Amino acid sequence: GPVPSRARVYTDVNTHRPSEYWDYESHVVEWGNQDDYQLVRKLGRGKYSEVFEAINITNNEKVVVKILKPVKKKKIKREIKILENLRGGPNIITLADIVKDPVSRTPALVFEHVNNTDFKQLYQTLTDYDIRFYMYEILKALDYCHSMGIMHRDVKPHNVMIDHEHRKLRLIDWGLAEFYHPGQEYNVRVASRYFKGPELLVDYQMYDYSLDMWSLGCMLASMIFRKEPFFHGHDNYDQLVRIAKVLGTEDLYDYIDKYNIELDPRFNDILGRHSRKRWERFVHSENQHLVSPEALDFLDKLLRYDHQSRLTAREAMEHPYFYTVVK
């Protein structure tokens, strides 16, 4: 079978915590008054959520309502529990209330308002200094949620909300988030295709927090090189081929060998043979102002097949890339 693995850091946070903390199935939800909130305008839609800009009429404060769908139920408790556990953490979206429609029974989460600005929208104009600043702010959120025994599992530009005039950032959408229990074989059908780590792609189920660090490296690559997305696969299979064409097949097969991974037969004829392409090869006139030898060293330390070899969120925070961020 595959070689076992444990997160290098924050391994036993859930192990030494009482079941009330991580046992979301047992969480009794405290429902608020739905009559306090009124819809202002449509903010977006997903495959299980409808997001709106709203107003609390009791104080006239702006809020964001996320109406949950019945497609994926009993997964509403995991999200609610994770938001309440992370409440107050640096750059973590604030769950302000939980409400339910008395007739349709459809639940809705009421969040603190943040400017409806995704990271994607800003990167096109961000300078080297703001890429470093916001990347550090994302790392504060990831170190916090990992320290609290939680993997986000959906790190992507869409899940980062920024109010640039206040240089204020929030990590949102905790709908795919999960509690880290060392030894757990998790479902690999998580994250978004372009941000899935090699572990998901080879069906290595005993992954951990380091999955989020791969997704973060994917975002950094996209930002410093102006290539959206950085790894553009046509499916989960081709996604690993796209990674292989950059990191190289040698290190992929060393990874599979190390963890005794049973590689799907489809990969034998599509993976092929590819040498490692140096990070500098992605540098050109339009993006050279966003690249530095520190940015490259840092990127190289995130985008690694072996989940155990990637920097932890706290180790990333200490990298020379962040020396220019003046606290």
């Binding site: 739905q34 009124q38 819809l39 429609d101 008395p102 007739v103 459809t106 809705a108």
Partner: peptide, 13 residues
Amino acid sequence: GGRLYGFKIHGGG
């Protein structure tokens, strides 16, 4: 009935 998912629609401060 002009309520969306139980929420009334706001118009204007």
